[PDB]
Design a protein around this ligand. Structure first.
Ligand code: XVP
Lengths: 99, 99
């Protein structure tokens, strides 16, 4: 598909058996999801953006389905205001910017 | 062009007659550039990100050239960690997401 940018590029994702709405974000290196208690090991991390840093839990090799396209990678979980799909997963679904 | 996301989508921009590097950021509503001197009126504004809010200077109807494509729109200037081109200007240059 093609997604115009008049509105936020929000799409449905499937993760850890749950459906959620997330932002396709070319400005995020990594994927940051709202608080959810996913099973398995995790490592503490701090990620910074506008306004400073927040503490997140880094889970590795997490599967996520993004509009029917599967991707497997690192997911950071924490008090993010929005579910953010970053480049680590956008690359796997073949997403590009075009103008 | 078509820009893949294996690397950060950084491009050269031209603003106020100066060249800079900026990130094409589909997760940003607005365009926020690091501290710099622009001519003309500006108004104080606040914008929020992953880590909280920052104070910026809002410059309206600013000419900016992004990877060779012209835009005239709002530019916020302030303590952003990196220059980000948001949707307000990405739409003007005809940028879309595709997978
Ligand atoms: C708390 C109240 O904030 P809030 O609810 C908004 O919440 C939001 C918070 C974040 C975003 C996404 C970010 N966009 C953003 O900063 O945009 C600003 C300017 O345009 C406005 O539009 C939306 C916000 C304003 C950006 O795409 C991605 N970032 C990196 C860039 C900064 C490059 C360093 S990152 O997320 O920091 C980040 C860092 C590290 C990792 C791990 O690799 C992953 C993600 C969108 C909405 O309301 C406020 C309007």
């Amino acid at each position: 598909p093609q997604i115009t940018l008049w509105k936020r590029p929000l799409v449905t994702i499937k993760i850890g058996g749950q459906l959620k709405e997330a932002l396709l974000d070319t400005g995020a290196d990594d994927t940051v999801l709202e608080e959810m208690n996913l099973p398995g090991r995790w490592k503490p991390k701090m990620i910074g953006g506008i306004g400073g840093f927040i503490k997140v839990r880094q889970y590795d090799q997490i599967l996520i389905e993004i509009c029917g396209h599967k991707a497997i990678g690192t997911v950071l979980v924490g008090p993010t205001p929005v579910n953010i799909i970053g480049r680590n997963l956008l690359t796997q679904i073949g997403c590009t910017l075009n103008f």
